[PDB]
Write an enzyme that holds these catalytic residues in place. Structure first.
Site, PDB file in Angstrom:
ATOM      1  N   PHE A 190      -0.720  -1.092 -11.705  1.00 39.29           N
ATOM      2  CA  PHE A 190       0.482  -1.789 -11.244  1.00 39.29           C
ATOM      3  C   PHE A 190       1.716  -0.871 -11.219  1.00 39.29           C
ATOM      4  O   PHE A 190       2.776  -1.226 -11.746  1.00 39.29           O
ATOM      5  CB  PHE A 190       0.790  -3.015 -12.128  1.00 39.29           C
ATOM      6  CG  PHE A 190      -0.035  -4.252 -11.833  1.00 39.29           C
ATOM      7  CD1 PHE A 190      -0.108  -5.260 -12.779  1.00 39.29           C
ATOM      8  CD2 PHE A 190      -0.701  -4.435 -10.630  1.00 39.29           C
ATOM      9  CE1 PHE A 190      -0.831  -6.403 -12.547  1.00 39.29           C
ATOM     10  CE2 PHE A 190      -1.431  -5.577 -10.396  1.00 39.29           C
ATOM     11  CZ  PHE A 190      -1.488  -6.570 -11.350  1.00 39.29           C
ATOM     12  N   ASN A 226     -10.072   2.868  -8.240  1.00 42.30           N
ATOM     13  CA  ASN A 226      -8.675   3.072  -8.604  1.00 42.30           C
ATOM     14  C   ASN A 226      -8.331   2.443  -9.938  1.00 42.30           C
ATOM     15  O   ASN A 226      -8.880   1.405 -10.323  1.00 42.30           O
ATOM     16  CB  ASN A 226      -7.752   2.529  -7.515  1.00 42.30           C
ATOM     17  CG  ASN A 226      -7.455   1.064  -7.678  1.00 42.30           C
ATOM     18  OD1 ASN A 226      -6.531   0.681  -8.405  1.00 42.30           O
ATOM     19  ND2 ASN A 226      -8.245   0.221  -7.015  1.00 42.30           N
ATOM     20  N   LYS A 240      -5.563 -14.980  -6.624  1.00 43.04           N
ATOM     21  CA  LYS A 240      -6.522 -13.928  -6.309  1.00 43.04           C
ATOM     22  C   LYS A 240      -7.434 -13.665  -7.488  1.00 43.04           C
ATOM     23  O   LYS A 240      -6.969 -13.391  -8.598  1.00 43.04           O
ATOM     24  CB  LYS A 240      -5.808 -12.646  -5.906  1.00 43.04           C
ATOM     25  CG  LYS A 240      -6.770 -11.543  -5.485  1.00 43.04           C
ATOM     26  CD  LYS A 240      -6.034 -10.412  -4.797  1.00 43.04           C
ATOM     27  CE  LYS A 240      -6.972  -9.327  -4.313  1.00 43.04           C
ATOM     28  NZ  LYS A 240      -6.221  -8.237  -3.634  1.00 43.04           N
ATOM     29  N   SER A 293      -6.517  -8.021 -11.453  1.00 40.16           N
ATOM     30  CA  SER A 293      -6.575  -6.570 -11.554  1.00 40.16           C
ATOM     31  C   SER A 293      -7.393  -6.154 -12.767  1.00 40.16           C
ATOM     32  O   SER A 293      -7.194  -6.680 -13.856  1.00 40.16           O
ATOM     33  CB  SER A 293      -5.205  -5.956 -11.677  1.00 40.16           C
ATOM     34  OG  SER A 293      -5.348  -4.575 -11.969  1.00 40.16           O
ATOM     35  N   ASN A 350     -10.646  -9.395  -5.570  1.00 40.96           N
ATOM     36  CA  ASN A 350     -10.147  -8.109  -6.034  1.00 40.96           C
ATOM     37  C   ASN A 350     -11.310  -7.108  -6.166  1.00 40.96           C
ATOM     38  O   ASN A 350     -12.460  -7.404  -5.819  1.00 40.96           O
ATOM     39  CB  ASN A 350      -9.428  -8.291  -7.370  1.00 40.96           C
ATOM     40  CG  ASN A 350      -8.230  -7.386  -7.513  1.00 40.96           C
ATOM     41  OD1 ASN A 350      -8.319  -6.190  -7.256  1.00 40.96           O
ATOM     42  ND2 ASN A 350      -7.089  -7.960  -7.908  1.00 40.96           N
ATOM     43  N   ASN A 400      -7.095  -3.338 -14.169  1.00 40.05           N
ATOM     44  CA  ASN A 400      -6.374  -2.194 -14.732  1.00 40.05           C
ATOM     45  C   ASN A 400      -5.144  -2.543 -15.551  1.00 40.05           C
ATOM     46  O   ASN A 400      -4.316  -1.677 -15.832  1.00 40.05           O
ATOM     47  CB  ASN A 400      -5.978  -1.262 -13.597  1.00 40.05           C
ATOM     48  CG  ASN A 400      -7.166  -0.840 -12.786  1.00 40.05           C
ATOM     49  OD1 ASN A 400      -8.218  -0.524 -13.341  1.00 40.05           O
ATOM     50  ND2 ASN A 400      -7.034  -0.879 -11.473  1.00 40.05           N
ATOM     51  N   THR A 401      -5.033  -3.807 -15.935  1.00 34.09           N
ATOM     52  CA  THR A 401      -4.000  -4.237 -16.871  1.00 34.09           C
ATOM     53  C   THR A 401      -4.662  -5.019 -17.989  1.00 34.09           C
ATOM     54  O   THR A 401      -5.331  -6.019 -17.742  1.00 34.09           O
ATOM     55  CB  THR A 401      -2.930  -5.084 -16.177  1.00 34.09           C
ATOM     56  OG1 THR A 401      -2.190  -4.243 -15.288  1.00 34.09           O
ATOM     57  CG2 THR A 401      -1.964  -5.704 -17.184  1.00 34.09           C
TER      58      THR A 401
HETATM   59  C1  LIG Z   1      -5.967   1.831  -4.253  1.00 35.25           C
HETATM   60  C2  LIG Z   1      -6.044   0.328  -4.335  1.00 35.25           C
HETATM   61  C3  LIG Z   1      -4.965  -0.370  -4.858  1.00 35.25           C
HETATM   62  C4  LIG Z   1      -4.994  -1.760  -4.946  1.00 35.25           C
HETATM   63  N1  LIG Z   1      -3.915  -2.438  -5.464  1.00 35.25           N
HETATM   64  C5  LIG Z   1      -3.916  -3.811  -5.535  1.00 35.25           C
HETATM   65  C6  LIG Z   1      -2.812  -4.519  -6.034  1.00 35.25           C
HETATM   66  O1  LIG Z   1      -1.757  -3.956  -6.395  1.00 35.25           O
HETATM   67  N2  LIG Z   1      -2.884  -5.891  -6.089  1.00 35.25           N
HETATM   68  C7  LIG Z   1      -4.006  -6.574  -5.683  1.00 35.25           C
HETATM   69  O2  LIG Z   1      -4.045  -7.799  -5.746  1.00 35.25           O
HETATM   70  N3  LIG Z   1      -5.081  -5.889  -5.182  1.00 35.25           N
HETATM   71  C8  LIG Z   1      -5.047  -4.517  -5.110  1.00 35.25           C
HETATM   72  N4  LIG Z   1      -6.136  -3.849  -4.596  1.00 35.25           N
HETATM   73  C9  LIG Z   1      -7.345  -4.633  -4.178  1.00 35.25           C
HETATM   74  C10 LIG Z   1      -7.416  -4.872  -2.684  1.00 35.25           C
HETATM   75  O3  LIG Z   1      -6.348  -5.721  -2.331  1.00 35.25           O
HETATM   76  C11 LIG Z   1      -8.717  -5.560  -2.291  1.00 35.25           C
HETATM   77  O4  LIG Z   1      -8.774  -6.810  -2.970  1.00 35.25           O
HETATM   78  C12 LIG Z   1      -9.943  -4.715  -2.641  1.00 35.25           C
HETATM   79  O5  LIG Z   1      -9.684  -3.331  -2.548  1.00 35.25           O
HETATM   80  C13 LIG Z   1     -11.158  -5.045  -1.788  1.00 35.25           C
HETATM   81  O6  LIG Z   1     -10.918  -4.833  -0.410  1.00 35.25           O
HETATM   82  P1  LIG Z   1     -11.409  -3.454   0.303  1.00 35.25           P
HETATM   83  O7  LIG Z   1     -12.868  -3.232  -0.091  1.00 35.25           O
HETATM   84  O8  LIG Z   1     -11.250  -3.700   1.795  1.00 35.25           O
HETATM   85  O9  LIG Z   1     -10.517  -2.295  -0.179  1.00 35.25           O
HETATM   86  C14 LIG Z   1      -6.111  -2.459  -4.510  1.00 35.25           C
HETATM   87  C15 LIG Z   1      -7.188  -1.752  -3.987  1.00 35.25           C
HETATM   88  C16 LIG Z   1      -7.162  -0.369  -3.900  1.00 35.25           C
HETATM   89  C17 LIG Z   1      -8.357   0.351  -3.336  1.00 35.25           C
HETATM   90  O1  LIG Z   2      -2.586  -1.485  -9.469  1.00 38.22           O
HETATM   91  C1  LIG Z   2      -3.778  -1.373  -9.730  1.00 38.22           C
HETATM   92  O2  LIG Z   2      -4.472  -0.643 -10.431  1.00 38.22           O
HETATM   93  C2  LIG Z   2      -4.722  -2.486  -9.068  1.00 38.22           C
HETATM   94  C3  LIG Z   2      -4.264  -3.819  -9.068  1.00 38.22           C
HETATM   95  C4  LIG Z   2      -5.235  -4.807  -8.490  1.00 38.22           C
HETATM   96  O3  LIG Z   2      -4.951  -6.009  -8.445  1.00 38.22           O
HETATM   97  N1  LIG Z   2      -6.444  -4.322  -8.048  1.00 38.22           N
HETATM   98  C5  LIG Z   2      -6.874  -3.031  -8.069  1.00 38.22           C
HETATM   99  O4  LIG Z   2      -7.936  -2.591  -7.675  1.00 38.22           O
HETATM  100  N2  LIG Z   2      -5.886  -2.103  -8.642  1.00 38.22           N
END
Ligand SMILES: Cc1cc2nc3c(=O)[nH]c(=O)nc-3n(C[C@H](O)[C@H](O)[C@H](O)COP(=O)(O)O)c2cc1C
Ligand SMILES: O=C(O)c1cc(=O)[nH]c(=O)[nH]1
Ligand SMILES: CC(C)[C@H]1CC(=O)c2nnn(-c3cc(F)c(-c4cc(CO)ccc4F)c(F)c3)c2C1
Ligand SMILES: CCCCCCCCCCCC[N+](C)(C)[O-]
Ligand SMILES: [Cl-]
Ligand SMILES: [Cl-]
Ligand SMILES: [Cl-]
Ligand code: NA
Ligand code: NA
EC number: 1.3.5.2
Length: 366
Positions: free
Chosen positions: A119, A115, A225, A185, A254, A187-188
């Site tokens: 944000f 992804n 995080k 993240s 993350n 992506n910023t």
């Molecule tokens: C689509 C998507 C959006 C995410 N958005 C955020 C986010 O806004 N803030 C954040 O701290 N982590 C974000 N994450 C990271 C997840 O919180 C997590 O740290 C990461 O995906 C690993 O866990 P998983 O393998 O169970 O998905 C996002 C992950 C995915 C897949």
């Molecule tokens: O908003 C997002 O792109 C995003 C934020 C984050 O902390 N981690 C991630 O995988 N995506």
């Protein structure tokens, strides 16, 4: 192996994946969850799964990771799904749209997602009012062992990152059991540089000062995080700063900007953070290292590629007090929550642990 688990895994989720692009599928998932359109969890949590950490009781250690409910729209639906705690966000101070679509990609052959949302956020004020509408309901949930975390981000065009996070502390801190300073993240632009020692100490000092300025019953724990892609130097530095300042915990990890050897998905070379199974052991190892560097004295929420009791227990034994998942939901659906909890309970018994608490960091005690 319940009836629901196999049906979702074999029929429902694959069909839904076949019909909808990943972002549309996510939006639908949030809507269905918010409307409570899911089976109320049959699995009643046993005492073995209770954890006391971060100044709170967690009735079970399996939480929903940030990014699923970015804007705090589905919190109650997520407790209904069986999560022991809910983390919303990331939330940015001002609303912003995030990156252009498409910005989310499925790698089914890898049980992974990439992804680059960037944000996308309704912003602090909208989320503030959303949480205010259910603030006392949440107070009761928290008392009953179901806490709420709020993950804070920064706006793309912000000139002062620390002030963005400070604003988040002041606006949503009073509504949260814990806050997350998300400096990881991928992506910023420039965000992850906030993980460097000097920047981090300055940022976190400001954040903690703002937190300490809140009235006692509105004063949340503060966690940082971090990325799975840190150098050994970065990890040493973060550990040092976190202990120095009395940061309450770490969320580890993350998504990764790495692309592990062996990815099969056609979309493996898309820009963004990789989640799911290819991240699992990278995350677990980051937990393991951060636990050791902090002498086991800093609570860790472990996250990355969890979709089974074994995955969860590996992170707990490596040092996590709690775990989260997100990507597994994309492949297994809601039944995965009960599955992980049931499997975790069985493994704890099998390995001679009295409960989750006994297993935390157990790998480090030989
Ligand atoms: C689509 C998507 C959006 C995410 N958005 C955020 C986010 O806004 N803030 C954040 O701290 N982590 C974000 N994450 C990271 C997840 O919180 C997590 O740290 C990461 O995906 C690993 O866990 P998983 O393998 O169970 O998905 C996002 C992950 C995915 C897949
Ligand atoms: O908003 C997002 O792109 C995003 C934020 C984050 O902390 N981690 C991630 O995988 N995506
Ligand atoms: C970026 C993530 C989120 C998406 C990635 C992706 O490509 C994908 N493909 N399917 N899916 C998905 C769709 C759903 F509808 C639910 C869901 C369904 C019910 C109905 O009982 C109740 C609650 C739910 F959350 C679900 F858990 C996952 C996703 C999520
Ligand atoms: C539905 C597809 C199933 C994929 C399950 C993956 C199991 C773990 C393999 C990924 C390992 C990545 N690595 C090398 C960085 O550890
Ligand atoms: Cl409030
Ligand atoms: Cl006062
Ligand atoms: Cl390639
Ligand atoms: Na550093
Ligand atoms: Na996970």
């Amino acid at each position: 192996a319940t009836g629901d688990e196999r049906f979702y895994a074999e029929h429902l989720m694959p069909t839904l994946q076949g019909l909808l692009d990943p972002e549309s599928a996510h939006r639908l998932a949030v809507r269905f969850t918010s409307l409570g359109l899911l089976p109320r969890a049959r699995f009643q949590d046993s005492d073995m799964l209770e954890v006391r950490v971060l100044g709170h009781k967690f009735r079970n250690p399996v939480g929903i990771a940030a990014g699923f409910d970015k804007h705090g729209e589905a919190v109650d639906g997520l407790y209904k799904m069986g999560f022991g705690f809910v983390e919303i966000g990331s939330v940015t101070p001002k609303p912003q749209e995030g990156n252009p679509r498409p910005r989310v990609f499925r790698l089914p052959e890898d049980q992974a997602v990439i992804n680059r949302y960037g944000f996308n956020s309704h912003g602090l004020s909208v989320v503030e009012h959303r949480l205010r509408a259910r603030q006392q309901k949440q107070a009761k949930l928290t008392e009953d062992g179901l806490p709420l975390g709020v993950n804070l981000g920064k706006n793309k065009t912000s000139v002062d990152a620390a002030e963005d996070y400070a604003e988040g502390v002041r606006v949503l801190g009073p509504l949260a059991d814990y806050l997350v300073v998300n400096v990881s993240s991928p992506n910023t632009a420039g965000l992850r540089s906030l993980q460097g020692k000097a920047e981090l100490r300055r940022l976190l000092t400001k954040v903690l000062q703002e937190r300490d300025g809140l009235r006692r019953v509105h004063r949340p724990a503060v966690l940082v995080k971090i990325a799975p892609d840190l150098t050994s130097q970065d990890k040493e530095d973060i550990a040092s700063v976190v202990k120095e300042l009395g940061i309450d915990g770490l969320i580890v990890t993350n998504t990764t900007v790495s692309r592990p050897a062996g990815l099969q998905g056609a979309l493996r070379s898309e820009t963004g953070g990789l989640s799911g199974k290819p991240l699992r052991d990278l995350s677990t190892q980051t937990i393991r290292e951060m636990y050791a560097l902090t002498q086991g004295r800093v609570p860790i929420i472990g996250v990355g590629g969890v979709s089974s009791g074994q995955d969860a227990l590996e992170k707990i034994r490596a040092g996590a007090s709690l775990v989260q998942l997100y990507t597994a939901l994309t492949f297994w659906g809601p039944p995965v929550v009960g599955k992980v909890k049931r499997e975790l309970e069985a493994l704890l018994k099998e390995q001679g642990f009295g409960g989750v608490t006994d297993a935390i960091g157990a790998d480090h005690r030989r």
